[PDB]
């Protein structure tokens, strides 16, 4: 039952400054204080092995911040987070250079990831075959369409084998043919008990892909558990929000904004 990722009291503050001159003013005098925006607050999570967790919520909830903190790219202001293995993150926009070709991009990205050359030499064909680009693997990435760039990024990221994988809204641009192949790859990954996080706004894909659901509201983990319990509550909340009047939705958003903001 080993805990693949453990989360203790993670909290991320961001300081609001209307202008850079206010930043200068608070830099000159340490006594100055400004309003602080709380991206996260008191998040506690426990991810086990062989678990697929889908994060659900409205825009501005804080799921991308949580995925970045799990990946280590962001440092929590208060709290801690530990991972048993090494974590790999697939994002909506893969970082590729339009000037370099496909093979040059494979080499550049796999070097930056932390692979020595001997592995790259043996791993290039498999990535080339998985990409399905063909002749365009020789031309620069700026000539590619968005779907092909997404395919190349996914192919590079999946071939290296992560102990923990965090996919964040990366399958929106791919077609159904690529989606089926990605689903099969997810089955193969599930065979190895690795922990996979899936962030998507397509509820059909969340139903088909995941097994557990975490629900975050206003930078606070609202409900974590089995999908069959959490997902109906999220759907009911969505329908209720759709039933409200415009003024009621505005006042709900204002209440959330007041809760998140504070002067300290």
């Amino acid at each position: 039952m080993n805990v693949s990722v453990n989360i203790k009291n993670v909290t991320k503050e961001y300081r609001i400054y209307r202008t850079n001159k206010e930043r200068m003013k608070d830099a000159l005098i340490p006594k100055h204080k400004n309003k602080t925006f709380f991206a996260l607050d008191d998040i506690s999570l426990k991810a086990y092995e062989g678990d697929v967790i889908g994060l659900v919520g409205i825009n501005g909830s804080g799921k991308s911040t949580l995925s970045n903190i799990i990946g280590g790219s962001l440092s929590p202001t208060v709290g801690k987070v530990d991972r048993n293995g090494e974590v790999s993150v697939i994002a909506i926009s893969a970082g590729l250079s339009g000037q370099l070709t496909g093979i040059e991009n494979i080499e550049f990205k796999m070097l930056c990831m932390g692979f020595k050359r001997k592995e790259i030499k043996a791993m290039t064909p498999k990535i080339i075959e998985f990409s399905e680009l063909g002749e365009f693997i020789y031309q620069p990435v700026k000539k590619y369409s968005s779907g092909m760039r997404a395919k190349l990024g996914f192919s590079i990221n999946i071939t290296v084998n992560p102990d923990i994988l965090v996919i964040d809204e990366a399958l929106s641009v791919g077609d159904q043919t690529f989606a089926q192949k990605c689903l099969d790859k997810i089955y193969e990954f599930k065979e190895q008990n690795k922990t996979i996080f899936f962030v998507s706004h397509n509820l059909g894909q969340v139903r088909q892909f995941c097994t557990k659901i975490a629900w975050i509201e206003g930078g606070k983990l609202k409900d974590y558990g089995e999908l069959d319990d959490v997902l109906p509550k999220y759907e009911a909340f969505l329908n209720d929000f759709k039933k409200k009047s415009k003024a009621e939705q505005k006042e709900f958003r204002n209440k959330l904004d007041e809760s998140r903001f504070v002067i300290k």
Binding site: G71, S73, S75, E86, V89, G95, S97, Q99, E104, C112
Partner: protein, 270 residues
């Protein structure tokens, strides 16, 4: 003592990564040009021509310095300036421009200024080889003393690297410093023995004594002693060597400490 150690271990371990990323950057910058990486040599060579038409033909009326023609004196003294200028100027912005791409992945952040400086070192090596080749047409042929370059060519690189390791960090904290850097570099071009030799015995004597504190003075003079003057430079001017070693040591220590101190909060500042 921990910051210096950590940065040293990172740079020691990631040598091949530094080289390969430097080569990729050289490839990226010259992608769309028809001539390509040839522009890494054409750009300085043309500039020297201007600096010879103004300061050598116009001023000085083409007179010799120390029995050597001014053209070869200036050629040997100017070889490292473009590398120093470009390396410092771009390594100041390296972290700011390149943090986002490698932030998501785990990858040592100390080597970001060093691989950009390495991208500029290659052109310096090519220009220096060309300079040594072209010096032969006068009658100046390589001697034993040229082995001194094995100490002098690396030192220059080290110096540049150290400065960037500091300035890059500051560049994240305060943007204005980047702008300031440009001005300082210009001063170090003109209060140096690159284009002129101070006359001494007067106010120019005070200017000479003030220029002796410039590291560019030591680098230019040592290169000239190795290639042109046929003289063991460290025999007479070892005090300058010690002062410059101390300068680079202090720069590296302060930069390493500052980089390790603010490394975790780079995203907040950026």
């Amino acid at each position: 003592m921990s910051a210096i150690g950590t940065v040293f271990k990172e740079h020691v371990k990631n040598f091949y990564l530094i080289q390969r990323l430097a080569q990729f950057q050289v490839k990226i910058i010259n992608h769309s040009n028809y001539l390509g990486v040839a522009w890494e040599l054409i750009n300085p060579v043309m500039q020297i021509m201007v600096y010879w038409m103004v300061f050598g033909l116009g001023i000085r009326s083409n007179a010799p310095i120390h029995g050597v023609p001014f053209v070869y004196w200036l050629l040997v003294g100017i070889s490292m300036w473009f590398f120093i200028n470009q390396g410092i100027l771009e390594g100041t912005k390296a972290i700011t421009q390149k943090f986002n791409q490698v932030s998501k992945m785990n990858f040592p952040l100390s080597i970001i200024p060093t691989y950009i400086v390495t991208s500029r070192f290659y052109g310096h090596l090519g220009l220096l080889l060309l300079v040594i080749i072209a010096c032969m047409f006068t009658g100046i042929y390589p001697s034993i003393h040229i082995i001194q370059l094995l100490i002098y060519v690396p030192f220059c690189f080290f110096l540049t690297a150290s400065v960037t390791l500091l300035t890059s960090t500051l560049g994240v904290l305060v943007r204005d410093t980047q702008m300031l850097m440009q001005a300082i570099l210009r001063i170090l071009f003109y209060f140096s023995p690159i284009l002129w030799l101070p006359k001494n015995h007067g106010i120019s004597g005070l200017i000479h004594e003030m220029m002796k504190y410039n590291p560019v003075y030591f680098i230019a003079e040592s290169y000239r002693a190795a290639i042109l003057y046929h003289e063991w430079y460290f025999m007479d001017h070892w005090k300058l060597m010690l002062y410059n070693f101390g300068i680079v040591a202090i720069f590296f220590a302060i930069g390493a400490y500052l980089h390790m101190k603010y490394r975790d909060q780079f995203a907040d500042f950026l």
